[PDB]
Design a protein around this ligand. Structure first.
Ligand SMILES: CCOc1ccc(B(O)O)cc1
Ligand SMILES: CCOc1ccc(B(O)O)cc1
Lengths: 237, 300
């Protein structure tokens, strides 16, 4: 059934699985029309499909042309997500196909179940975790490729950079979720924390800076402090 | 006007005949039911006074044979049987009539209720849902599971209703996933009506039979089938106008007949609210919506 605190280590076992997050598929700016009405303008989006054991990120870029002439875009976006996840699975060799797909929003279950009827052995699950994958567009290199796309495109990343050379996938996922949660709670501060030291650079083939183990512990502390801080600013505690 | 005689009534039982039910006392001088209208299917059903567990009964059409009930003390139930000796049967019934040992099917002349509940139900289709081909009548009880329930255990004693499943390859065309899931017209009109049932009358007959088995035996899988067949229609944007109008009549008489006190277990809150208030056909079931809102506004 659902993925929650009690079965959290299942994410890091040897059964291939993917998280799917659709919160950045359909993105709009809202603006006033000359007549003083309100209209939306779509901007490019992306499906966030992540293997939490390996870090492999399948970033399907959703170009604004896919919405042209369509109605009920927020409902279409869930089906378009499901259509693209199903196409990815079919594109993978059998032994790379996931045994489970975990959606971050329950509204994806039926769209995905329906698109995956051909794969009755792939379990489609919700989760009670509140994961911060919506903040993936606060990672500059991911936001850049999304906004520059002029056509539908799939781009492959490792969201863990080279961390798995030194730490486990449980710790790598913990780090990622902490970073993303911070970026979601206060993007400016989070990015300030991540980049304040110009001697620590982001490799051309990486998403995050090249911190030593010692520097990551400090960074991770600063991110917790930020989250705690914002919780205080927010609730006045 | 036909007759179902009884050899006797040895155990105290509540006997149902269509929508009518009456009590028979242990060894009460009782020989059966007369004046049964020709032209409709009928159901004679039983609930023992000493164990209301297992309601059970028999669907039959008197045009297809001479049928009687005889208690079986080994199997512990009232069994339907066919008498092939037609002269023997007439003689037995005549004597039961002369001694006023039969209760009369109590139809009020104004009352089209049974016709309206069984309008599209046909013994030949009942016998394909309930497989027991050596008899011309069909046994149903409270506990019998459906072919779909067994997928999700004895196949000889199952209800072989048509499997309806909205998240199935049958229901969803490759490349029309969203379209077919949100508007089920393909599944209703091409798969089910053109493909499986052939016409709407056969679809309505199964729907009505499933309702009646839900109501008279509390058969849970029958209730599931009844609601699925309603939902498939209400969730289709394209339904022939004559089917919608007839559906409204069908459901109206079903809601009208339902025991007020059983609405909590025979009516699915989700399906009905969806069908009357959110579905494509939310405005197409005027009679049903009016009787539902005036009789079961709590469910809605
Ligand atoms: C207790 C069963 O009662 C009976 C009454 C009458 C007959 B008969 O043929 O009229 C048979 C049995
Ligand atoms: C032969 C008459 O047998 C009867 C059996 C039952 C009832 B009753 O109202 O429950 C009436 C008559």
């Amino acid at each position: 059934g659902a993925m929650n605190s009690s079965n959290y280590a299942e994410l890091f076992n040897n059964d291939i699985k993917l998280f799917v997050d659709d919160t950045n598929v359909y993105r709009v700016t809202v603006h006033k029309t000359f007549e003083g009405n309100v209209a939306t303008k779509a901007i490019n989006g992306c499906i966030f499909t992540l293997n939490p054991k390996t870090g492999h990120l399948f970033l399907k870029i959703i170009h604004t042309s896919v919405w042209a002439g369509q109605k009920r875009l927020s409902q279409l976006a869930k089906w378009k997500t499901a259509e693209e996840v199903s196409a990815l699975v079919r594109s993978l060799p059998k032994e790379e196909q996931p045994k489970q797909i975990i959606v971050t929003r329950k509204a994806m279950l039926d769209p995905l179940e329906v698109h995956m009827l051909d794969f009755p052995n792939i379990a489609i699950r919700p989760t009670e975790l509140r994961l911060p994958f919506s903040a993936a567009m606060s990672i500059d290199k991911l936001s850049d490729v999304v906004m520059k796309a002029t056509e539908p495109q799939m781009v492959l990343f490792n969201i863990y950079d080279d961390w798995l050379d030194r730490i486990s996938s449980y710790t790598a996922f913990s780090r990622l979720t902490l970073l993303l949660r911070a970026l979601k709670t206060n993007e400016e501060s989070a990015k300030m924390i991540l980049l304040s030291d110009p001697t620590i650079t982001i490799k051309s083939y990486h998403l995050w800076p090249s911190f030593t183990d010692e520097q990551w512990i400090t960074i991770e502390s600063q991110m917790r402090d930020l989250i705690l801080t914002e919780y205080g600013r927010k609730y006045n505690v | 006007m036909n007759t179902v005689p009884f050899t006797s009534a040895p155990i105290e039982v509540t006997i149902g005949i269509d929508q009518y039910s009456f009590n028979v006392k242990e060894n009460q001088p009782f020989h059966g039911i007369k004046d049964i209208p020709i032209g409709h299917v009928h159901v004679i059903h039983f609930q023992h006074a000493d164990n209301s567990s297992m309601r059970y009964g028999y669907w039959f059409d008197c045009r297809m044979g001479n049928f009687y009930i005889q208690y079986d003390p080994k199997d512990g139930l009232y069994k339907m049987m066919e008498e092939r000796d037609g002269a023997k049967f007439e003689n037995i019934v005549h004597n039961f009539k002369e001694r006023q040992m039969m209760v009369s099917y109590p139809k009020i002349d104004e009352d089209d209720t049974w016709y309206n509940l069984t309008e599209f139900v046909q013994m030949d289709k009942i016998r394909k849902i309930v497989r027991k081909d050596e008899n011309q009548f069909s046994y149903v009880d409270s506990s019998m599971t459906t072919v779909q329930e067994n997928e999700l255990s004895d196949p000889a004693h199952s209800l072989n209703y048509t499997v309806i499943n909205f998240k199935s390859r049958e229901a969803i065309r490759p490349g029309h996933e969203m379209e077919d899931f949100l508007d089920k017209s393909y599944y209703l009109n091409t798969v089910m009506l053109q493909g499986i049932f052939k016409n709407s009358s056969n679809y309505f007959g199964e729907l009505q039979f499933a309702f009646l088995n839900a109501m008279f035996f509390g058969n849970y899988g029958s209730s599931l089938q009844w609601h699925a067949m309603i939902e498939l229609i209400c969730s289709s944007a394209t339904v022939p106008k004559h089917m919608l109008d007839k559906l409204d009549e069908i459901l109206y008489y079903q809601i009208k007949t339902l025991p007020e006190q059983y609405s909590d277990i025979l009516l699915n809150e989700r399906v009905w609210n969806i069908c009357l208030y959110s579905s494509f056909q939310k405005n197409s079931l005027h009679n049903t919506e009016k009787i539902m809102e005036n009789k079961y506004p709590e469910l809605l």
